[PDB]
Ligand binder design. Sequence first.
Ligand SMILES: *[C@@H]1O[C@H](CO)[C@@H](O)[C@H](O)[C@H]1NC(C)=O
Ligand SMILES: *[C@@H]1O[C@H](CO)[C@@H](O)[C@H](O)[C@H]1NC(C)=O
Ligand SMILES: [Ca+2]
Ligand SMILES: [Ca+2]
Ligand SMILES: [Fe+3]
Lengths: 638, 638, 515
Amino acid sequence: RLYWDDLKRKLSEKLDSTDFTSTIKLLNENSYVPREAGSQKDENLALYVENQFREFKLSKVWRDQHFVKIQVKDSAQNSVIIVDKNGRLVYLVENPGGYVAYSKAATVTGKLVHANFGTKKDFEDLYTPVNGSIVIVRAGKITFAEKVANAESLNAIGVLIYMDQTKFPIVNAELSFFGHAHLGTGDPYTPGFPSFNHTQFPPSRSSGLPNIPVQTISRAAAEKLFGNMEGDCPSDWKTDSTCRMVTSESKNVKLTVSNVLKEIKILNIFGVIKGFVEPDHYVVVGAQRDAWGPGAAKSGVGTALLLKLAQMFSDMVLKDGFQPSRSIIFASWSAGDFGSVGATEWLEGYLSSLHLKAFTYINLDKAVLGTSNFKVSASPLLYTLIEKTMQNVKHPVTGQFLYQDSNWASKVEKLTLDNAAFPFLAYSGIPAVSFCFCEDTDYPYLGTTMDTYKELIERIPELNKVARAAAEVAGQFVIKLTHDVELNLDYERYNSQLLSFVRDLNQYRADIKEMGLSLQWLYSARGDFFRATSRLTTDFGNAEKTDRFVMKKLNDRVMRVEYHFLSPYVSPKESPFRHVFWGSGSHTLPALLENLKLRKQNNGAFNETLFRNQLALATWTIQGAANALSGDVWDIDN
Amino acid sequence: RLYWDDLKRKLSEKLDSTDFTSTIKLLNENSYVPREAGSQKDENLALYVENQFREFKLSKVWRDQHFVKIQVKDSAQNSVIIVDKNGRLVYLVENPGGYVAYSKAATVTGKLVHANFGTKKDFEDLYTPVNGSIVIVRAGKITFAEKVANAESLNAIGVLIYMDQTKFPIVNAELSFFGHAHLGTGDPYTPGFPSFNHTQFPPSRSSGLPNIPVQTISRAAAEKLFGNMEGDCPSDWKTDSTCRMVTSESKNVKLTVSNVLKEIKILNIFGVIKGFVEPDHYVVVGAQRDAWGPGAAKSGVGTALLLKLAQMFSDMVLKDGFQPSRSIIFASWSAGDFGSVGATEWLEGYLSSLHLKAFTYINLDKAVLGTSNFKVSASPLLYTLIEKTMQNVKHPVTGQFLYQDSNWASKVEKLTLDNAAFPFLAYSGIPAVSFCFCEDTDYPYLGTTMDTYKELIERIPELNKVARAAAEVAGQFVIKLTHDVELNLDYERYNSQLLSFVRDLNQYRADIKEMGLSLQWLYSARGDFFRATSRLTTDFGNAEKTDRFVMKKLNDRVMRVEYHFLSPYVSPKESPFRHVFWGSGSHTLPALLENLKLRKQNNGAFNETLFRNQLALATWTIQGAANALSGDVWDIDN
Amino acid sequence: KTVRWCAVSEHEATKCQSFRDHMKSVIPSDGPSVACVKKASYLDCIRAIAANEADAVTLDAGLVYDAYLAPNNLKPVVAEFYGSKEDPQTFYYAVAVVKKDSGFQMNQLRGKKSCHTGLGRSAGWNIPIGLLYCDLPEPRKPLEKAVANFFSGSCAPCADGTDFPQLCQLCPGCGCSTLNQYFGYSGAFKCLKDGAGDVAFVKHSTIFENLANKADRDQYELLCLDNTRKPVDEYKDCHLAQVPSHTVVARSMGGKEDLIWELLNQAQEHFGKDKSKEFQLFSSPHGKDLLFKDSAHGFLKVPPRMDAKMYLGYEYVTAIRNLREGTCPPTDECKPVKWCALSHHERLKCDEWSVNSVGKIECVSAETTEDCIAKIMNGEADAMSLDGGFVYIAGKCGLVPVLAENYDKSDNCEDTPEAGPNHAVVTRKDKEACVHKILRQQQHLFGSDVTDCSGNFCLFRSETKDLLFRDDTVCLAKLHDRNTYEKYLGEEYVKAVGNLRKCSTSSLLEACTFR
Ligand SMILES: *[C@@H]1O[C@H](CO)[C@@H](O)[C@H](O)[C@H]1NC(C)=O
Ligand SMILES: *[C@@H]1O[C@H](CO)[C@@H](O)[C@H](O)[C@H]1NC(C)=O
Ligand SMILES: [Ca+2]
Ligand SMILES: [Ca+2]
Ligand SMILES: [Fe+3]
């Protein structure tokens, strides 16, 4: 009855009549001005969205309530001061308004070294040893948790995070920001398992939790610190001319953090539209609802895009007659500010119920930050679906299409820990996507209270149009993923990914040979994988698209593709991000190479015993993912 | 065309014309007399079975070759002697002909205490402390590995295993036996991953490997040891009147084991008959091929039953016109003597390829040992399938049916580590079954070289008939599992299993309450599970059996049932037997209770922190297994 | 044994029982017999043979594509020939028939009314629409909705009337049966002669099957590719494209290819053309083109090896798949050349090369040297090295060599070719440009290199002996001349292997030399 083009057009029309700005402002009203996860006002917007979903007359509307532990600044405000060698001295630098959730909470004192961004590479180039000293960094180089993680590895005492004026063009230099340092997804006190009264909340501590205090300070506060510091910072790093490398031997800084953890009631509001051909299979669309400050850019826009997309698709079904082959779930997560907590609890919670039932995830968080370029980070399995959408949707400002860079696939960057999509792909093994109408430079007031509607609508005049273009891209991802019998997942995309891996590992073939090791098995592992997809491709080509049975047997195999890249061997609890390509730790393909790089310097940082295993598990994992994809167990000889 | 009854009859007829004894003797010929895993004669029988399968004109015949590490007795024979307090003294006790694979291989000397069977319960009742002393035990109480494991826990120096005359009515008191002490399944040097050149065999050591020497000795040898020991053994244990509790303070034993590990080429021969409705889904039938000694009872019978069943079913298809809905795989494993090595390598190896493709496993090892009673240990999901078969097959001696004990379900015992089926159920999450025409007392020469065809046919006159009755029971399991659209797996069986768990845990509700804990969540967890199966039951009742699509969605859900009981949280590598009900370690339901029992004595053996987690993960695991079974994710409110 | 047969509509069902009664009169000498199964459309017949209900039914080359797809899996066993029994033809001409003095040409077909033989049929849909798809106004998919807008009125047999109202403007319901006046070759012509459509896409023999008067035939003209019009009688000089003849299909496994051909070869002698006065297999008073095509003059055996995608050939299979996806093609960017390996050692050497080539070369595996050749044909593979003998086998299929393995060392190896014959790198027609380019780029990266392979990769050296290429090869010379299997093997060697193939015949050679 209704084909793609008829759906594309019906979507565009619905978009034209939809007013986004009006919704984004309504979510910024005085009743929703403060959204801190677990607040009465967080729940306020929770009920709203729920009643809104119910109003859209969706097939089903439910809610999950978790009791996770976050962290807050109590009556005992933290403080950063510079002291003398014998004891307290110098002057009070600042009384932080903002903090860093999941900080060790303690009082430390010592020299202050500027580690710049705080990248593992930044520390290695530092001429000043970071051991036994407090380090100060600039945010956005890597997640807040990684800055603290990389510093603690080199035995730091504490960490200070600020926003220079170069990377952050903010007038008010007294403005403070918020963030968390947990190198983990979701609640950190129920690592690897769902937070529900059901579990009785047994004593459990995430390994991603830092053992060092972390505090945020305003630009002015850092400049005050630079005044007591000497050593001009390298031009290499585009930074302020205020920046100072280290403190004088006479005076050092004394950081005191006393954050206290709090138990809150988080709410996840959902809405599901059942498909007609396959009710059980479903794509998930989500958006963060909570926000430390007003959060218009952080959550305002996303939650707005969620409400409208749930609206536009409910209309296309109820009214227009749009028939979805697979269900579509809309999720409004909370506790996002603390690390995709809300979402990750849901994943850890209904993993069994979504094993191979959920085939993709679309995240709406931070979809609108600028207007210059269009950025998207996701699983290769969606690269094709994206590319086809890029050349279908037109930029909100310039009339040209989003598809301008042919080799854009090669410029795509991994999904990070702060992205709500990360948990889905690296932990659950569900292909995820995260697009953005980004700007060359990140949004200034992203964590600041400055992230109001006025500030957003001012930095982005045509906000409504950009929000529509956004909703459109996500809207087509849904139409493509649930529309027709074929699943728009392109398992073939990965061949480039594996080829890249092996090519980088082939460079170190000299060291491989020196050890009792051959690299021939990985060559075959990749080849076997390619022939596996090729056979799958032909198996699709030699099939009757209308036959429900022959397609299920072919689409079912395709869905696993992602799952089979989740390393089986590692414990999901201790190492939740099992995916070899996008997860974390030694098991991940990057880790194997990362460790081998140390072998080239002939130092003792390289572990041979570890490598031999990193290699053996990885090669099989690629190898077994290939054996499965073909079609059967008995047929594959080699 | 052909219904059950028509299949039952066509099977019986094929059975009547089939001669088993003749095959069992042919496998005991001089060319197959020694089968030690990896031997030229082991491979001999391997080729035979392969060519035999190919002769049966099966749809596909393949082979897997692993390079696993076993252990053997080298030129340096081990020896057990009694010595004096200052140094060597007393007389040479024995030069063991047989050994215990995977022993620590070292020389130890110390007091000798009789731990009887070596059960964790046996050690607790011992009036003599086992710390810092060599212990002697009697086999069959628990696997060889468990005896060593339980002793090492109480800090033993070494272990001696013998066969008393009571439990073992063997005339020749000089006869020695073989076995392994690895508390693991498959090869112990590739724990949790397949042994293939592909992995390059990275350095890896199983945690199931003992750090204490273990040696087997003949009855006479033990009696010689009892002559130097004092203290009459308790009547509690039905044992010889020779048995002595401990050695005199003047003389103690000195055990010296020097076994050396060897790398061998193991071969797994397979044969697959494709189903017609669902080629991808399949039940697996296997049997051990290797044998330390002649192994007529250990592997002779099983391998014989495999060859014939592959024959009888090939005939029913090629000739009779039997149409199988799902494929059937026949496997001849090797290295079985070392702990289901051959089979477990295959499971670890093609796990991804068999995730939810393999729905059941039928093991033929040790199916014929006696004639008195019929024993069967398997997953509840097969209890009904078994019960229905028991009252369908007639005993080979008495004309009565096998179904004589109504409450037989409650008498069934867990699958053990030495059983080839264990790995399938506890590790892979594939329902497994293992029946037996057993005898009240285990087969005497099971590990002895005494396990010849002459000895078997003599202790079992009507061997052929009993072998046929055996082949028949397994034959119907196959007909039932692949025959019709419904899968003969009874997910409902588990309700009794969970009810039992909760009832035993309810006894300790006093301690639960004392701790900040409520047992209400587990009550619900069980209830939710029951209502889940009930809804599934009705969902089957309210469906058109002829509709291919509605049954797939219902049979697919049923298959997972087993998988969902495999604890997700634990690392498969370190703790491979993830299944909560039948696996190993703290995660398993038994472990949770086992630990809580220590809380009743108010001692420090009970770990509270561990329990709270053992509980939290277990309750969810039961809870999540229930949420999944229903049918969908959105519908379940509670 | 009895060979069931599927019939569509009532007219064909009556011709079926007559196919039964008539045969049993002289039958059965050994065993053959025919049966009759009732079906609404040809789609029901293909689905029936897969369910063992039937055993064989004749399909159009364009409808063969739908029969071999999963789960139908049906391979053609016996193919009918056109023309005469003396000089049989395995390919019929597809042409567009229009009225005289119409004004419309091939390029100007928009708005005009159309009459098609049957949605999916060679002459009726695949060839005629095939050239217009890329010119059609978007959206191109669904292809059916695009045609519904291009033509004003049209009759497409077997088309969805509910989803497409315009496609059944001429013949409501869009019946696929003979019960529908406008169905098949003769049905589309009666859609033109009746003034319902301005054009009818059929076969070159359709004009003679309906009209007998040469004076009545002059009232019609024939459309040509170069936007011209020529007399209908000039079908060879002016036509659209050549397509494979109609063939009977049966299951790939358990379809009884021999028991069906034994029936047809005996049925053409008893109730065939110019053999009997009682019954004719290619003529019936109840309808035209029943069971078989009236234009046919017999049957011919379809080789064993030859499958559905090999019977239609690369040129045609690709064209149908592209027509259904809406793919319209040079950028000269090229695509990774799929190399075909035979043994375990070849793929391993190939895989290590694939990685070293940065994805320029990929690896496809085949069981036998003859099986790799089959994959290069349908598109699963692209190129492989072959010896003189196999080059002749491959050449007879449609693969022309582009590189030669020189063995004599010289200053300029690639520039100057060597006669011998030597090992040649056969490839497909379309992928000849890139193979010629890509493999030439590796020569400078993995060709003549110092004996340091121990660390780096070497293309000509093999772990064992002659894997992907011969070890004693110095370079891969480019054949500047448009060389074929005949132009590369000289002349004497050509006849040599030909006669030797007469006694020692392979399953592939008998397939590539069939049509
Ligand atoms: C869950 O536990 C919290 C304390 O952590 C308690 O306040 C709340 O009432 C409990 N709710 C339920 C349903 O048990
Ligand atoms: C596998 O490794 C063993 C040594 O452990 C070696 O003897 C054998 O030849 C190797 N086989 C292959 C195919 O690599
Ligand atoms: Ca958690
Ligand atoms: Ca292993
Ligand atoms: Fe035709």
